[PDB]
Amino acid sequence: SSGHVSFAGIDYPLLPLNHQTPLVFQWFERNPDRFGQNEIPIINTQKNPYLNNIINAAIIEKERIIGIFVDGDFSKGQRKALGKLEQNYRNIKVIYNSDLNYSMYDKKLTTIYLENITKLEARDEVLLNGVKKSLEDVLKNPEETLISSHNKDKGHLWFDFYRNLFLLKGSDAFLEAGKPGCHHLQPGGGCIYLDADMLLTDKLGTLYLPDGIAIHVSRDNHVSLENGIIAVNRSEHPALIKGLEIMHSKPYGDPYNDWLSKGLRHYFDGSHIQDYDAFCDFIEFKHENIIMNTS
C-alpha cells in the first residue's frame, strides 16, 4: 500500500515515519562533575561535537521534535542549562530518565529464576549446569528486579537497557514527560533514535520502513547490526516486545548479542532460514543525509 518487503515467508508492509516521528538522542552521564556546573552536560569538543550534532539536526528538522533523553546526577545549574537549550531551540525537548515509569516492563529476578527452574525440571549438560547455577542465583536482595539491578551499573548496560525501554515507549515518552509543544506527536507513535555522533546534512523527510522498523548496519566483507540508528513507527513495536520477552525469560545477559538484536532476528526470522547477511540487508536503515560516527 505503501508497498511491501518480503522476508522469511512474510510480506511486511512498508510503513511511513513522517515528520510527526521525533528524533531521539541519548546522553547518560556517569561523571557530570566533569562538566561545568552551569553548562550543558553533553560532550561538545572539536573531536566529539555531540551537542553541535544534535543542534544541527534540530535546526534542519525544523518540523520535527528532537528529544534528548538523559540520565545522571546533574546539578541544578546543569538542569537549567538544559532548560535554556529548550528555550533557544523550540523543537528540542529534554527528557530525564527519572521522570519516566518503566514498571510495566519490569520483572522480579526471583520470578525469572523460578520460571527457569520450573522449565529446567523437564536434556543436556547445558541445562543441568544452567539449572544449578540459576538455582544458586535465586538463593541470593530479594526485592530486586531488572530495573533495580540495571540501576546499579553505571556503564553500558545502564545505557542500553534504558535505550531499549525508551524505544518501547516511543513518542509516548515525550507525552509522559509532559513536554511543551508536543501536540503534533502521534500518541502511541514511534521515534528515530540516533547516536549523537552523526552528521545530518539535510532533511530526512518521511521514511518508509519494513513493518515500520529499521536499524543501522555497518558493512568490508563483513556486515553487522549496529546500534547507532534505531527507527520504529509505533510504541511497543512487536519486534522490540520480542526482545523484552527474551530478557524476561532468560537469567543471564549475552554481551555481544543483546536482547534488542536477538528480539529483532527472532521476530523476523525465528527459524534462521535466511542468513544473517540477508537479515541485515532487510532491516538496514539507509539514508543518504545521515553520516554515522563522523568523529
Numbering used by the authors: 39 to 160, 166 to 183, 185 to 263, 265 to 340
The authors write:
The glycosylation target is an arginine residue, which was unexpected because the guanidine group of arginine is nucleophilically poor at physiological pH. The T3SS effectors SseK1 and SseK2 from Salmonella typhimurium SL1344 are NleB orthologs that behave as NleB1-like GTs, although they differ in protein substrate specificity. Here, by using a combination of X-ray crystallography, STD-NMR, enzyme kinetics, molecular dynamics simulations, and in vivo experiments, we show that these enzymes are GT-A fold retaining GTs that most likely follow an SNi mechanism.
SseK2 can be divided into three types of sub-domains, namely the catalytic domain (40–147 and 185–336), which includes the Rossmann-like domains, the protruded helix-loop-helix (HLH) domain (148–184), and the C-terminal lid domain (337–348). Therefore, the electron density map for this domain was not resolved. In the ground state of SseK2, the C-terminal lid domain is highly flexible, impeding its visualization in the crystal structure.
